[PDB]
């Protein structure tokens, strides 16, 4: 019926003085833009069709053409950034926002999807969607007693669009808009559907990606326990953003970090630090590195949960990027830990896998490790044990690796490599 039209025929139809001929051609445009192998999006834009589509959004009297042009537009908006730009420059935004209140859910859903692609494109369009007043009628669509009564795809759609209004930085979303969206987000974070849960987690991880004031307004809503619980989920699409949000929160103050520990997060980490998925292991170690950079009582809680052997583990064998995070975790730990805590880290076997990494030709992990070896020696000084530690380091070929580091380009590598040699080796 409306399949395989040319662009010139779509144009002929959309230009006629006949609403039905136009509906027909609009639907033809929609199918053409929906095709899987390269849809002629730029041919449609060049044909001048977007202002016509956008004007059909207003045809209250003809809901089917509202729907087809809506859909045609979202196919273009979901394309590249300049394609999205074309849609916004057609005056689509206030037109789509008016459609959120449409009696027809198939049309409201379409406007939700459109707005999510426009907002998701970047900071300026996100903020422009918010200025045109999108947030109120978006939140109005979830003002039901129980979310379980909404259509599943409809709910995933709204959730996904809210996550895009939380997304991007420079600038981050307006505080006013975040505070307005945040309560609905908390509610969706408790909804039982894996995709609504993944999108909400992403929303939260976008909001926690910033300065402590931002982390605070999220933490203050009490989502951290629900985050930790999702950190435990079986679905990798839920764990991945849940771990990102937790990882963000512990880059904040000691008190915010402590909220995560109190929530029971550390009990999940033996799994996370041995996870078969490389990125989960990378983010979990990065998270550990921000927890061992906190207070001594927080370092101690890492110890009490039996997490130090898992750090020794990651340091020993992991993707190199994860090993770098692990070395940071160790340096932070050795930097702010008590003498007892640093001693324990040596008993768990940190020295040898530490030394092995001094063979990595990455200048900044070497700095980090040499700094860590230095912190450990200072703990050994307060016990007159620089002795035994030197022997340990010597026995796993750790001295050979530091001697040789007295011939590695970098300034700080020598002045530490040399210094260590002078100070603790004959
Ligand atoms: N809860 C506090 C979070 C901030 C930590 C801060 N500085 C310590 C530090 C240094 C380097 C890293 C790092 C760099 C690259 C990759 N991974 C980890 C992380 C932390 C501090 N409190 O002392």
Q: What keywords describe this structure?
A:
mainly alpha; transport protein; Leucine-rich Repeat Variant; binds N~2~-[4-(pyridin-3-yl)benzyl]-L-lysinamide; elongated; 426 residues; monomer
Q: What do these coordinates show?
A:
With 426 residues, the chain is mostly helical. The chain has one domain: Leucine-rich Repeat Variant (Alpha Horseshoe), CATH 1.25.10.10. The protein has helices spanning 7-14, 19-34, 41-46, 50-56, 63-77, 81-89, 92-99, 105-120, 123-131, 135-140, 152-165, 175-188, 194-207, 212-219, 224-231, 236-249, 254-262, 269-272, 278-291, 296-304, 308-316, 320-336, 339-347, 351-356, 363-381, 386-395, 398-403, 411-424. Helix 19 (278-291) runs parallel beside helix 22, helix 21 crosses helix 22 and helix 22 runs parallel beside helix 25. The structure holds N~2~-[4-(pyridin-3-yl)benzyl]-L-lysinamide. It is classed as transport protein. Keywords: TPX2, inhibitor, transport protein.
């Amino acid at each position: 019926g409306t399949v395989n039209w040319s662009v010139e025929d779509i144009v002929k139809g959309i230009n006629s003085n006949n609403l039905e001929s136009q509906l027909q051609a609009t639907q033809a445009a929609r199918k053409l833009l929906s095709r899987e192998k390269q849809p002629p999006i730029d041919n449609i834009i060049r044909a001048g069709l977007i202002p016509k589509f956008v004007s059909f959004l207003g045809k209250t009297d003809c809901s089917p053409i509202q729907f087809e042009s809506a859909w045609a537009l979202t196919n273009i908006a979901s394309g590249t950034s300049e394609q999205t730009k074309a849609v916004v420059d057609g005056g689509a935004i206030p037109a789509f926002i008016s459609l959120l209140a449409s009696p027809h859910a198939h049309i409201s859903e379409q406007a939700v999807w459109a707005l999510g692609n426009i907002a998701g494109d970047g900071s300026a369009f996100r903020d422009l969607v918010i200025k045109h007043g999108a947030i109120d009628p978006l939140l109005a669509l979830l003002a039901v007693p129980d979310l379980s009564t909404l259509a599943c795809g409809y709910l995933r759609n709204l959730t996904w669009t809210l996550s895009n209004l939380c997304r991007n930085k420079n600038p981050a979303p307006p505080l006013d808009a975040v505070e307005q969206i945040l309560p609905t987000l908390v509610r969706l974070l408790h909804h039982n559907d894996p995709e609504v849960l993944a999108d909400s987690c992403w929303a939260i991880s976008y909001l926690t990606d910033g300065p402590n004031e931002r982390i605070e307004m999220v933490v203050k809503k009490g989502v951290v326990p629900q985050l930790v619980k999702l950190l435990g989920a079986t679905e990798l699409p839920i764990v991945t953003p849940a771990l990102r949000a937790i990882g963000n929160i512990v880059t904040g103050t000691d008190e915010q970090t402590q909220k995560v520990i109190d929530a029971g997060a550390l009990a999940v980490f033996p799994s996370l630090l041995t996870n078969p998925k490389t990125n989960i292991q990378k983010e979990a170690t990065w998270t550990m590195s921000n927890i061992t950079a906190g207070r001594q009582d927080q370092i101690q809680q890492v110890v009490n949960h039996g997490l130090v052997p898992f750090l020794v583990g990651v340091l020993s064998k992991a993707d190199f990027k994860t090993q770098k995070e692990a070395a940071w975790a160790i340096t932070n730990y050795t930097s702010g830990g008590t003498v007892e805590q640093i001693v324990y880290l040596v008993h768990c076997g940190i020295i040898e896998p530490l030394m092995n990494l001094l063979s990595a030709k990455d200048t900044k992990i070497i700095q980090v490790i040499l700094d860590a070896i230095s912190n450990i020696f200072q703990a050994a000084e307060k016990l007159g044990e620089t002795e035994k530690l030197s022997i340990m380091i010597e026995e796993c070929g750790g001295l050979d690796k530091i001697e040789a580091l007295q011939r590695h380009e970098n300034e700080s590598v020598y002045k530490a490599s040399l210094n260590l040699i002078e100070k603790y080796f004959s």
